[PDB]
Ligand SMILES: [Mg+2]
Ligand SMILES: [Mg+2]
């Protein structure tokens with residue numbers, strides 16, 4: 001019937017912010033993405049009502065105009081890929097992701113579609129400034145994202161629900177959070193040393209914030225996803241199945257895991273090595289950028305209509321979810 005969300009904002013010690021360029025870059029980005037005909041009229045109606053750019057405002061509130069607009073275009077592009085592939089079988093979703101992937105990776109490749117052209121335009125923005133390290137890893141993130149979205153579609157169409165360990169590997173990639181973290185070096189204007197990405201403390205912070213985003217998105221989006229038969233790619237479903245618990249308990253377990261990840265993130269922050277004044281300053285800005293993503297994703301979730309409907313503002317305070325019919 002109903003359940004209550006875990007109180008994730010109460011567990012978040014970070015102070016959220018928004019981007020002052022939101023009004024102008026969002027109008028530009030929304031006009032850009034809507035210049036393409038790719039979604040059904042019903043999907044369009046929800047898409048243009050989802051406040052996609054507001055998510056970017058909350059999660060990259062420090063971005064300068066140029067970089068912020070690029071992030072808006074990118075998140076709008078991801079939402080397009082997501083909503084198109086949601087309505088597709090496994091082979092069609094794999095082809096959709098491969099349009100994005102080839103357009104990103106191969107400067108010659110353009111199959112003529114609206115999605116290819118959209119990807120090429122974001123790509124040209126990214127490549128104005130992105131460093132060789134950031135871009136090389138971004139393309140690797142692109143391939144992992146596409147493979148995970150395609151496999152999500154295959155498993156959805158077959159009814160297969162992954163075991164929790166396999167689910168987390170897949171969800172980390174098909175949530176696109178690694179792509180979004182992958183723009184930090186672009187937004188901040190500087191590549192991190194490749195050695196930083198295999199520091200054990202930095203890896204701990206990276207994965208704790210990525211998982212916080214994944215698990216909080218899952219418990220928030222569960223209602224809308226189960227109502228459209230999409231609940232297989234969701235930790236709530238995985239927990240009910242494999243731990244044999246009911247919905248409120250799975251919700252409670254999301255909250256316990258979120259608190260564990262947040263504690264690990266905050267306690268790990270202090271153990272960060274020091275490499276040099278300039279590297280340390282850049283690393284610190286990257287770590288603050290993960291904090292803004294964790295906090296901004298939470299805040300946006302209660303500002304958009306995407307997960308909670310038109311009464312989303314009230315749900316922020318009651319956390320009471322009534323399950324939607326099919
Ligand atoms: Mg989705
Ligand atoms: Mg996502």
Ligand SMILES: [Mg+2]
Nearest residue numbers: 217218221225
């Ligand atoms: Mg979701």
Ligand SMILES: [Mg+2]
Nearest residue numbers: 082152174233
């Ligand atoms: Mg999905």
